[PDB]
Short mmCIF file of C-alpha atoms and ligand atoms in Angstrom, two decimals:
data_model
loop_
_atom_site.label_atom_id
_atom_site.label_comp_id
_atom_site.label_asym_id
_atom_site.label_seq_id
_atom_site.Cartn_x
_atom_site.Cartn_y
_atom_site.Cartn_z
CA UNK W 1 25.22 -10.95 -9.14
CA UNK W 2 24.84 -8.12 -6.41
CA UNK W 3 26.33 -9.08 -3.02
CA UNK W 4 23.60 -7.40 -1.01
CA UNK W 5 21.29 -9.68 -2.68
CA UNK W 6 23.59 -12.68 -2.22
CA UNK W 7 23.87 -11.87 1.48
CA UNK W 8 20.28 -11.86 2.19
CA UNK W 9 19.85 -15.23 0.33
CA UNK W 10 22.35 -16.72 2.89
CA UNK W 11 20.84 -14.77 5.73
CA UNK W 12 17.27 -16.52 5.06
CA UNK W 13 16.04 -18.28 7.98
CA UNK W 14 15.39 -21.88 8.10
CA UNK W 15 11.57 -22.58 7.84
CA UNK W 16 9.68 -23.61 11.09
CA UNK W 17 6.85 -25.94 11.54
CA UNK W 18 3.28 -24.82 12.84
CA UNK W 19 2.86 -28.10 14.98
CA UNK W 20 -1.01 -28.07 15.01
CA UNK W 21 -2.16 -29.59 18.41
CA UNK W 22 -3.23 -33.07 17.44
CA UNK W 23 -4.89 -33.76 20.53
CA UNK W 24 -7.32 -30.61 19.90
CA UNK W 25 -10.52 -30.84 17.62
CA UNK W 26 -10.18 -28.74 14.80
CA UNK W 27 -12.28 -25.53 14.83
CA UNK W 28 -12.09 -21.88 14.40
CA UNK W 29 -10.31 -21.39 17.38
CA UNK W 30 -7.71 -24.25 16.97
CA UNK W 31 -6.88 -22.90 13.44
CA UNK W 32 -6.23 -18.92 14.94
CA UNK W 33 -4.52 -20.11 17.91
CA UNK W 34 -2.23 -22.32 15.75
CA UNK W 35 -1.45 -19.45 12.88
CA UNK W 36 -0.87 -16.64 16.14
CA UNK W 37 1.27 -19.24 17.51
CA UNK W 38 3.40 -19.63 14.40
CA UNK W 39 3.08 -16.11 13.91
CA UNK W 40 4.58 -15.35 17.40
CA UNK W 41 7.94 -17.49 16.83
CA UNK W 42 8.61 -16.38 13.19
CA UNK W 43 8.61 -12.90 14.68
CA UNK W 44 11.48 -14.05 17.04
CA UNK W 45 13.12 -15.18 13.82
CA UNK W 46 12.31 -12.18 11.99
CA UNK W 47 14.20 -9.92 14.62
CA UNK W 48 17.17 -12.02 14.36
CA UNK W 49 17.23 -11.88 10.54
CA UNK W 50 17.01 -8.29 10.28
CA UNK W 51 20.43 -7.97 12.40
CA UNK W 52 22.09 -9.47 9.02
CA UNK W 53 20.46 -6.52 6.94
CA UNK W 54 23.21 -4.03 5.90
CA UNK W 55 23.28 -0.97 8.25
CA UNK W 56 20.14 -2.18 10.26
CA UNK W 57 21.85 -2.93 13.65
CA UNK W 58 23.87 0.32 13.53
CA UNK W 59 20.43 2.22 13.94
CA UNK W 60 19.40 2.97 17.45
CA UNK W 61 17.42 0.20 19.17
CA UNK W 62 14.25 2.67 19.07
CA UNK W 63 14.41 2.93 15.15
CA UNK W 64 15.09 -0.81 15.23
CA UNK W 65 11.83 -1.50 17.07
CA UNK W 66 10.17 1.13 15.07
CA UNK W 67 10.78 -0.53 11.66
CA UNK W 68 10.01 -4.09 12.86
CA UNK W 69 6.70 -2.88 14.87
CA UNK W 70 5.69 -1.52 11.15
CA UNK W 71 6.67 -3.92 9.10
CA UNK W 72 6.15 -7.23 10.81
CA UNK W 73 2.92 -8.04 9.32
CA UNK W 74 4.22 -7.45 5.47
CA UNK W 75 7.29 -9.64 6.25
CA UNK W 76 4.91 -12.38 7.50
CA UNK W 77 2.97 -12.15 4.75
CA UNK W 78 5.38 -12.10 2.01
CA UNK W 79 6.83 -15.34 3.63
CA UNK W 80 3.54 -17.10 3.07
CA UNK W 81 3.17 -15.89 -0.29
CA UNK W 82 6.38 -17.03 -1.41
CA UNK W 83 6.15 -20.30 0.31
CA UNK W 84 2.62 -20.71 -1.70
CA UNK W 85 4.19 -19.96 -5.50
CA UNK W 86 4.08 -23.65 -6.62
CA UNK W 87 0.59 -24.26 -5.10
CA UNK W 88 -2.70 -23.66 -6.82
CA UNK W 89 -5.57 -22.03 -4.19
CA UNK W 90 -3.60 -23.22 -1.09
CA UNK W 91 -1.37 -20.99 1.26
CA UNK W 92 1.53 -22.67 2.89
CA UNK W 93 1.56 -21.15 6.19
CA UNK W 94 4.18 -24.12 6.90
CA UNK W 95 4.99 -27.29 5.39
CA UNK W 96 2.60 -29.00 8.16
CA UNK W 97 -0.09 -26.23 7.84
CA UNK W 98 -1.55 -25.83 4.31
CA UNK W 99 -4.98 -23.78 4.07
CA UNK W 100 -7.18 -24.48 1.28
CA UNK W 101 -10.46 -22.32 0.88
CA UNK W 102 -12.32 -24.82 3.02
CA UNK W 103 -10.06 -24.56 5.82
CA UNK W 104 -10.00 -20.45 5.34
CA UNK W 105 -13.79 -20.35 5.60
CA UNK W 106 -13.62 -22.62 8.46
CA UNK W 107 -11.29 -19.95 10.32
CA UNK W 108 -13.08 -17.07 9.27
CA UNK W 109 -10.37 -15.97 7.22
CA UNK W 110 -11.99 -16.51 3.47
CA UNK W 111 -11.76 -12.55 2.51
CA UNK W 112 -8.29 -12.41 4.00
CA UNK W 113 -6.65 -15.54 2.73
CA UNK W 114 -8.29 -14.58 -0.87
CA UNK W 115 -6.38 -11.25 -0.71
CA UNK W 116 -3.14 -13.08 -0.08
CA UNK W 117 -4.03 -15.57 -2.63
CA UNK W 118 -4.09 -12.43 -5.04
CA UNK W 119 -0.58 -11.62 -4.17
CA UNK W 120 0.46 -15.15 -4.96
CA UNK W 121 -1.37 -14.83 -8.44
CA UNK W 122 0.52 -11.77 -9.25
CA UNK W 123 3.78 -13.02 -8.32
CA UNK W 124 3.48 -16.33 -10.17
CA UNK W 125 2.74 -14.55 -13.40
CA UNK W 126 6.03 -12.31 -12.68
CA UNK W 127 7.73 -15.57 -11.84
CA UNK W 128 9.09 -13.92 -8.62
CA UNK W 129 12.59 -15.63 -7.66
CA UNK W 130 14.00 -16.22 -4.46
CA UNK W 131 16.54 -13.28 -4.74
CA UNK W 132 13.82 -10.84 -5.53
CA UNK W 133 11.52 -12.30 -2.59
CA UNK W 134 14.20 -11.80 0.00
CA UNK W 135 15.20 -8.18 -1.18
CA UNK W 136 11.68 -7.15 -1.01
CA UNK W 137 11.26 -8.45 2.36
CA UNK W 138 14.29 -5.97 3.36
CA UNK W 139 12.85 -3.27 1.17
CA UNK W 140 9.24 -3.65 2.98
CA UNK W 141 11.37 -3.30 6.40
CA UNK W 142 12.93 -0.55 5.39
CA UNK W 143 9.96 1.05 3.61
CA UNK W 144 7.43 0.57 6.84
CA UNK W 145 6.45 4.27 7.11
CA UNK W 146 6.93 4.23 10.87
CA UNK W 147 5.54 7.81 12.58
CA UNK W 148 8.40 7.63 15.19
CA UNK W 149 11.82 7.34 13.36
CA UNK W 150 14.46 9.50 15.43
CA UNK W 151 17.20 9.18 12.41
CA UNK W 152 15.03 9.68 9.16
CA UNK W 153 18.17 10.19 6.77
CA UNK W 154 19.61 6.95 8.18
CA UNK W 155 16.62 4.82 7.64
CA UNK W 156 16.37 6.76 4.02
CA UNK W 157 19.85 5.33 3.51
CA UNK W 158 18.87 1.85 4.33
CA UNK W 159 15.82 2.08 1.87
CA UNK W 160 18.62 3.34 -0.49
CA UNK W 161 20.94 0.79 -0.33
CA UNK W 162 18.47 -2.30 -0.68
CA UNK W 163 16.64 -0.18 -3.41
CA UNK W 164 19.76 -0.03 -5.03
CA UNK W 165 20.37 -3.63 -4.50
CA UNK W 166 17.11 -4.42 -6.37
CA UNK W 167 18.05 -2.08 -9.28
CA UNK W 168 21.54 -3.82 -10.02
CA UNK W 169 20.21 -7.37 -9.38
CA UNK W 170 17.34 -6.73 -12.46
CA UNK W 171 19.61 -4.72 -14.61
CA UNK W 172 22.15 -7.67 -14.40
CA UNK W 173 19.76 -10.80 -14.24
CA UNK W 174 16.93 -9.20 -16.44
CA UNK W 175 18.14 -7.28 -19.31
CA UNK W 176 15.05 -8.33 -21.18
CA UNK W 177 12.67 -6.43 -18.96
CA UNK W 178 14.40 -2.74 -18.20
CA UNK W 179 11.06 -1.87 -16.15
CA UNK W 180 11.38 -5.43 -13.68
CA UNK W 181 12.54 -3.41 -10.59
CA UNK W 182 10.06 -0.80 -10.93
CA UNK W 183 7.21 -3.53 -11.41
CA UNK W 184 8.55 -5.39 -8.42
CA UNK W 185 8.27 -2.12 -6.30
CA UNK W 186 4.67 -1.72 -7.61
CA UNK W 187 3.75 -5.13 -6.03
CA UNK W 188 4.24 -3.33 -2.58
CA UNK W 189 0.95 -1.38 -2.61
CA UNK W 190 -1.30 -4.59 -2.51
CA UNK W 191 1.04 -6.21 0.24
CA UNK W 192 0.46 -3.03 2.29
CA UNK W 193 -3.30 -3.34 1.69
CA UNK W 194 -3.31 -6.87 2.67
CA UNK W 195 -1.25 -6.44 5.63
CA UNK W 196 -3.49 -3.27 6.98
CA UNK W 197 -6.60 -5.48 6.69
CA UNK W 198 -4.82 -8.30 8.46
CA UNK W 199 -3.91 -6.31 11.45
CA UNK W 200 -7.31 -4.80 11.38
CA UNK W 201 -9.10 -8.32 11.64
CA UNK W 202 -6.49 -9.85 14.44
CA UNK W 203 -6.67 -7.07 16.57
CA UNK W 204 -10.24 -7.52 16.73
CA UNK W 205 -9.75 -11.20 17.48
CA UNK W 206 -7.45 -10.18 20.06
CA UNK W 207 -10.18 -7.86 21.78
CA UNK W 208 -12.69 -10.74 21.39
CA UNK W 209 -10.32 -12.71 23.77
CA UNK W 210 -11.16 -16.34 22.73
CA UNK W 211 -7.79 -16.83 21.00
CA UNK W 212 -5.05 -17.10 23.39
CA UNK W 213 -1.95 -15.03 22.08
CA UNK W 214 1.82 -14.96 23.06
CA UNK W 215 3.69 -12.09 24.34
CA UNK W 216 5.39 -10.84 21.33
CA UNK W 217 2.77 -11.14 19.14
CA UNK W 218 0.56 -9.26 21.13
CA UNK W 219 3.08 -6.55 21.73
CA UNK W 220 3.46 -6.36 17.73
CA UNK W 221 0.01 -6.09 17.35
CA UNK W 222 -0.59 -3.57 20.19
CA UNK W 223 2.17 -1.34 18.67
CA UNK W 224 0.96 -1.82 14.96
CA UNK A 1 10.85 16.05 -21.52
CA UNK A 2 8.84 12.83 -21.86
CA UNK A 3 5.70 13.27 -23.93
CA UNK A 4 3.42 11.22 -21.71
CA UNK A 5 4.11 13.50 -18.95
CA UNK A 6 3.74 16.79 -20.78
CA UNK A 7 0.60 15.47 -22.19
CA UNK A 8 -0.77 14.55 -18.69
CA UNK A 9 0.37 18.14 -17.62
CA UNK A 10 -1.99 19.63 -20.10
CA UNK A 11 -4.76 17.01 -19.18
CA UNK A 12 -4.65 18.28 -15.67
CA UNK A 13 -8.39 19.50 -14.67
CA UNK A 14 -9.07 22.65 -13.24
CA UNK A 15 -9.58 22.82 -9.60
CA UNK A 16 -13.17 23.17 -8.12
CA UNK A 17 -14.56 24.87 -5.10
CA UNK A 18 -15.91 23.00 -2.05
CA UNK A 19 -18.85 25.93 -1.62
CA UNK A 20 -19.51 25.17 2.11
CA UNK A 21 -23.19 26.23 2.62
CA UNK A 22 -22.75 29.68 4.46
CA UNK A 23 -26.58 29.32 6.01
CA UNK A 24 -25.39 25.82 7.71
CA UNK A 25 -24.16 25.97 11.23
CA UNK A 26 -20.73 24.59 11.46
CA UNK A 27 -20.76 20.88 13.03
CA UNK A 28 -19.27 17.31 11.99
CA UNK A 29 -22.23 16.82 9.69
CA UNK A 30 -21.54 20.02 7.77
CA UNK A 31 -17.93 19.16 7.29
CA UNK A 32 -18.49 15.72 6.21
CA UNK A 33 -21.43 16.61 4.00
CA UNK A 34 -19.34 19.06 2.24
CA UNK A 35 -16.31 16.89 2.13
CA UNK A 36 -18.41 14.17 0.34
CA UNK A 37 -20.19 16.64 -1.71
CA UNK A 38 -16.50 17.73 -2.86
CA UNK A 39 -15.76 14.44 -3.66
CA UNK A 40 -18.81 13.52 -5.66
CA UNK A 41 -18.11 16.39 -7.97
CA UNK A 42 -14.35 15.52 -8.06
CA UNK A 43 -15.08 12.01 -9.34
CA UNK A 44 -16.97 13.14 -12.32
CA UNK A 45 -13.76 15.15 -13.49
CA UNK A 46 -11.61 12.24 -12.67
CA UNK A 47 -13.69 10.03 -15.11
CA UNK A 48 -13.39 12.63 -17.70
CA UNK A 49 -9.58 13.02 -16.75
CA UNK A 50 -9.00 9.30 -17.41
CA UNK A 51 -9.88 9.28 -20.90
CA UNK A 52 -6.66 11.66 -21.59
CA UNK A 53 -4.61 8.69 -20.33
CA UNK A 54 -3.08 6.79 -23.50
CA UNK A 55 -4.74 3.67 -23.84
CA UNK A 56 -7.37 4.09 -21.16
CA UNK A 57 -10.32 4.51 -23.30
CA UNK A 58 -9.55 1.49 -25.75
CA UNK A 59 -10.08 -0.48 -22.45
CA UNK A 60 -13.47 -2.09 -22.21
CA UNK A 61 -16.03 -0.17 -20.25
CA UNK A 62 -15.96 -2.77 -17.60
CA UNK A 63 -12.26 -2.59 -17.24
CA UNK A 64 -12.20 1.08 -17.28
CA UNK A 65 -15.10 1.34 -14.53
CA UNK A 66 -13.09 -1.63 -12.72
CA UNK A 67 -9.91 0.66 -12.37
CA UNK A 68 -11.80 3.50 -11.41
CA UNK A 69 -13.68 1.82 -8.78
CA UNK A 70 -10.75 0.63 -7.26
CA UNK A 71 -8.16 3.45 -7.69
CA UNK A 72 -10.71 6.69 -6.95
CA UNK A 73 -9.74 7.07 -3.17
CA UNK A 74 -6.14 7.16 -3.77
CA UNK A 75 -6.56 9.50 -6.70
CA UNK A 76 -8.83 12.04 -4.65
CA UNK A 77 -6.14 11.89 -1.80
CA UNK A 78 -3.21 12.34 -4.13
CA UNK A 79 -4.84 15.90 -4.93
CA UNK A 80 -5.35 17.05 -1.75
CA UNK A 81 -1.69 16.04 -0.79
CA UNK A 82 -0.41 18.01 -3.61
CA UNK A 83 -2.48 20.95 -2.82
CA UNK A 84 -1.24 20.99 0.43
CA UNK A 85 2.75 20.86 -0.40
CA UNK A 86 3.07 24.55 0.20
CA UNK A 87 1.08 24.51 3.71
CA UNK A 88 2.32 23.63 6.94
CA UNK A 89 -0.02 21.05 8.96
CA UNK A 90 -3.35 21.92 6.90
CA UNK A 91 -5.22 20.03 4.05
CA UNK A 92 -6.46 22.03 0.93
CA UNK A 93 -9.10 20.04 -0.17
CA UNK A 94 -10.12 23.22 -2.02
CA UNK A 95 -9.06 26.88 -2.22
CA UNK A 96 -12.16 27.41 0.14
CA UNK A 97 -11.79 24.47 2.17
CA UNK A 98 -8.52 24.24 4.43
CA UNK A 99 -8.62 22.08 7.30
CA UNK A 100 -6.47 22.64 10.60
CA UNK A 101 -5.95 20.31 13.20
CA UNK A 102 -8.98 21.56 15.07
CA UNK A 103 -11.32 21.33 12.36
CA UNK A 104 -10.12 17.80 11.55
CA UNK A 105 -10.93 16.83 15.25
CA UNK A 106 -14.40 18.62 14.92
CA UNK A 107 -15.10 16.17 11.93
CA UNK A 108 -13.75 12.83 13.37
CA UNK A 109 -11.00 13.05 10.90
CA UNK A 110 -8.08 13.53 12.83
CA UNK A 111 -6.09 10.23 12.60
CA UNK A 112 -7.16 10.12 9.20
CA UNK A 113 -6.14 13.43 8.06
CA UNK A 114 -2.85 13.11 10.04
CA UNK A 115 -1.85 10.05 7.76
CA UNK A 116 -2.63 12.28 4.96
CA UNK A 117 -0.15 14.93 6.19
CA UNK A 118 2.25 11.84 6.72
CA UNK A 119 2.00 11.75 3.14
CA UNK A 120 2.44 15.58 2.59
CA UNK A 121 5.34 15.41 4.69
CA UNK A 122 7.27 12.83 2.90
CA UNK A 123 6.66 14.42 -0.71
CA UNK A 124 7.96 17.73 0.70
CA UNK A 125 11.17 16.33 1.45
CA UNK A 126 11.29 14.83 -1.85
CA UNK A 127 10.26 18.01 -3.36
CA UNK A 128 7.52 16.27 -5.39
CA UNK A 129 6.99 18.11 -8.82
CA UNK A 130 3.95 18.59 -10.48
CA UNK A 131 5.02 16.52 -13.46
CA UNK A 132 5.63 13.81 -11.07
CA UNK A 133 2.17 14.14 -9.26
CA UNK A 134 0.22 13.89 -12.63
CA UNK A 135 2.34 10.88 -13.51
CA UNK A 136 1.85 9.15 -9.88
CA UNK A 137 -1.90 9.57 -10.16
CA UNK A 138 -2.16 7.74 -13.42
CA UNK A 139 0.06 4.95 -12.13
CA UNK A 140 -2.30 4.72 -9.12
CA UNK A 141 -5.01 4.33 -11.73
CA UNK A 142 -3.58 1.77 -13.52
CA UNK A 143 -1.93 -0.05 -10.63
CA UNK A 144 -5.03 -0.04 -8.64
CA UNK A 145 -5.15 -3.98 -8.11
CA UNK A 146 -8.64 -4.56 -9.09
CA UNK A 147 -10.01 -8.35 -8.78
CA UNK A 148 -12.25 -8.17 -11.84
CA UNK A 149 -10.09 -7.01 -14.86
CA UNK A 150 -10.88 -8.89 -18.28
CA UNK A 151 -7.91 -7.97 -20.35
CA UNK A 152 -5.11 -8.36 -17.91
CA UNK A 153 -2.44 -8.01 -20.49
CA UNK A 154 -4.03 -4.52 -21.34
CA UNK A 155 -3.76 -3.15 -18.14
CA UNK A 156 -0.39 -4.42 -17.54
CA UNK A 157 0.45 -2.66 -20.64
CA UNK A 158 -1.21 0.70 -19.45
CA UNK A 159 1.01 0.31 -16.15
CA UNK A 160 4.02 -0.29 -18.44
CA UNK A 161 3.50 2.60 -20.33
CA UNK A 162 3.12 5.14 -17.48
CA UNK A 163 5.74 3.43 -15.54
CA UNK A 164 7.96 3.88 -18.49
CA UNK A 165 7.22 7.74 -18.45
CA UNK A 166 7.99 8.04 -14.77
CA UNK A 167 11.64 6.34 -15.57
CA UNK A 168 12.10 8.51 -18.81
CA UNK A 169 11.25 11.43 -16.84
CA UNK A 170 13.21 10.94 -13.75
CA UNK A 171 16.41 9.99 -15.91
CA UNK A 172 16.25 12.91 -17.99
CA UNK A 173 15.30 15.69 -15.13
CA UNK A 174 16.94 13.86 -12.11
CA UNK A 175 20.22 12.56 -13.03
CA UNK A 176 21.81 13.39 -9.84
CA UNK A 177 19.54 10.71 -8.17
CA UNK A 178 19.30 7.59 -10.18
CA UNK A 179 16.96 5.88 -7.58
CA UNK A 180 14.36 8.87 -7.64
CA UNK A 181 11.82 7.04 -9.91
CA UNK A 182 12.01 3.89 -7.50
CA UNK A 183 11.51 6.24 -4.38
CA UNK A 184 8.45 7.80 -5.98
CA UNK A 185 6.97 4.27 -6.66
CA UNK A 186 7.87 3.37 -2.94
CA UNK A 187 5.42 6.13 -1.83
CA UNK A 188 2.53 4.27 -3.44
CA UNK A 189 2.22 1.94 -0.31
CA UNK A 190 1.68 4.52 2.19
CA UNK A 191 -1.14 6.13 -0.41
CA UNK A 192 -2.40 2.61 -0.65
CA UNK A 193 -2.47 2.44 3.52
CA UNK A 194 -4.36 5.70 3.78
CA UNK A 195 -7.00 5.21 1.13
CA UNK A 196 -7.74 1.83 2.67
CA UNK A 197 -8.55 3.31 6.03
CA UNK A 198 -10.05 6.15 4.58
CA UNK A 199 -12.63 4.00 2.40
CA UNK A 200 -13.20 1.80 5.80
CA UNK A 201 -14.23 5.26 7.67
CA UNK A 202 -16.57 6.68 4.83
CA UNK A 203 -18.04 3.34 4.69
CA UNK A 204 -18.98 3.51 7.96
CA UNK A 205 -20.36 6.95 7.77
CA UNK A 206 -22.50 5.83 4.75
CA UNK A 207 -23.92 3.12 7.21
CA UNK A 208 -24.48 5.57 10.17
CA UNK A 209 -26.87 7.26 7.65
CA UNK A 210 -26.44 10.77 9.42
CA UNK A 211 -24.25 12.27 6.10
CA UNK A 212 -26.14 12.57 2.93
CA UNK A 213 -24.05 11.27 -0.02
CA UNK A 214 -24.64 11.75 -3.60
CA UNK A 215 -25.23 8.98 -6.33
CA UNK A 216 -21.48 8.78 -7.78
CA UNK A 217 -19.99 8.89 -4.65
CA UNK A 218 -22.37 6.07 -3.14
CA UNK A 219 -21.61 4.00 -6.28
CA UNK A 220 -17.70 4.31 -5.73
CA UNK A 221 -17.86 3.45 -1.92
CA UNK A 222 -20.31 0.47 -2.41
CA UNK A 223 -17.87 -0.99 -5.39
CA UNK A 224 -14.91 -0.40 -3.36
C1 LIG X 1 -1.59 -12.44 11.81
C2 LIG X 1 -0.33 -13.30 11.02
C3 LIG X 1 -0.78 -14.39 10.65
C4 LIG X 1 -1.30 -15.43 11.39
C5 LIG X 1 0.22 -14.87 9.83
C6 LIG X 1 0.94 -16.26 10.43
C7 LIG X 1 2.19 -16.93 10.20
C8 LIG X 1 2.51 -16.13 8.81
O1 LIG X 1 3.90 -16.86 8.12
C9 LIG X 1 1.91 -15.12 7.96
C10 LIG X 1 0.65 -14.83 8.65
C11 LIG X 1 -1.94 -14.61 9.52
C12 LIG X 1 -2.14 -13.36 8.60
C13 LIG X 1 -2.98 -13.15 7.83
C14 LIG X 1 -3.88 -14.09 7.59
O2 LIG X 1 -5.05 -14.07 6.58
C15 LIG X 1 -3.78 -15.59 8.03
C16 LIG X 1 -2.76 -15.59 9.00
C1 LIG X 2 -13.83 10.35 0.93
C2 LIG X 2 -12.96 11.34 0.30
C3 LIG X 2 -12.43 12.48 1.00
C4 LIG X 2 -13.85 13.27 1.33
C5 LIG X 2 -12.23 13.68 0.09
C6 LIG X 2 -12.80 14.73 -0.48
C7 LIG X 2 -12.18 15.39 -1.47
C8 LIG X 2 -10.82 15.31 -1.90
O1 LIG X 2 -10.22 15.92 -2.65
C9 LIG X 2 -9.91 13.92 -1.17
C10 LIG X 2 -10.62 13.44 -0.40
C11 LIG X 2 -11.91 12.55 2.44
C12 LIG X 2 -11.21 11.23 2.32
C13 LIG X 2 -10.28 11.26 3.60
C14 LIG X 2 -10.03 12.25 4.54
O2 LIG X 2 -9.42 12.27 5.57
C15 LIG X 2 -11.16 13.33 4.02
C16 LIG X 2 -11.89 13.50 3.17
#
């Protein structure tokens, strides 16, 4: 099929482990600390992954940073959503960190994780493919609506290249549904809605100062 | 062109007036009271308008209400965005209520109105047409991601009918850009993001109890 899709598939990063501290008693602080630690390490991986998206590394460093600072939460959330598609009412943050409803309650994340579960449910019904997941991640980066872009036409070209990839993929692989590309694009509002609420929630956790957070996660949170 | 588009055009409601009280001194309370009063009357008009969307009135009354309760803020915001396309740095809430940056500051809405202005700016660059505006309003209603839908397949059919209308319209009217329909769909995340923040902001105004609000606006706010 489409070459951009095949390229994004081979550029997909390896999974990483959450490694919750086995000496620490389970608590809301432990869960939130584990999750923000995992996110910090995933952000390093996301920055490296974006260099593989066609045209991304030719943007100015400022525009690269603006896109990543706008899109990082959507990219992280799309990841856990995809990892969770074969599960029922559980979120696979990592192979060693799967959250059920009780754990979400304990961490203070019941409402936020339930919105992520709504995303999972919709993609399950659509039978979201890995090809579509990696293309949507890249589209979410290009379409992230930063207010600080220098070269707007170059970012629009990036959007166009990835959108065309999705169009072409669906036209060749899903002829039974001539609206599947658009259906995939119409899942992005709920992703943006959930990411908006997640950023607000974890910014409040940052302000409360009870959960330690690493440098990169704080930089992305403070920018966003 | 497409019949659904032509139908939505003739079903477009007439504009209504804000009618700020000329005896009341200008204040943040006056501005917010005027705006929520306008929104309350527009919500009545939106409920009547939705009956014209093909298939909408055949949904259960519960599903009709669920869609409207999820989508109402996006529909209102898309309206002011469209009315503002011929203006510069001003938001045309009504012909008699146009907000510039200073008035937004006075009302406590500078950040929220600036996000609405970001939507305006993007649609200006895309040269958003009335045909596209009315189709996107209907798509926003069908795609509003309510958690309480009874007949999910019927709501998906509604999404499909309106999405096909946009597809067909762009294929016939905008052959120069084979990705214009998708570009239009990719403006919906920023609309959802801005509406999410607006709902939070006006719910806080509701809780502070200093701005009087009418019955329907309160019902939509409390549901959403
Ligand atoms: C703030 C990001 C964070 C910790 C996260 C971490 C790793 C990951 O792969 C996806 C998301 C998160 C966001 C929302 C939420 O409900 C729970 C956790
Ligand atoms: C809460 C709805 C409200 C009052 C509104 C009213 C009429 C209308 O056509 C569109 C929106 C609004 C929302 C966000 C905002 O920044 C300013 C005002």
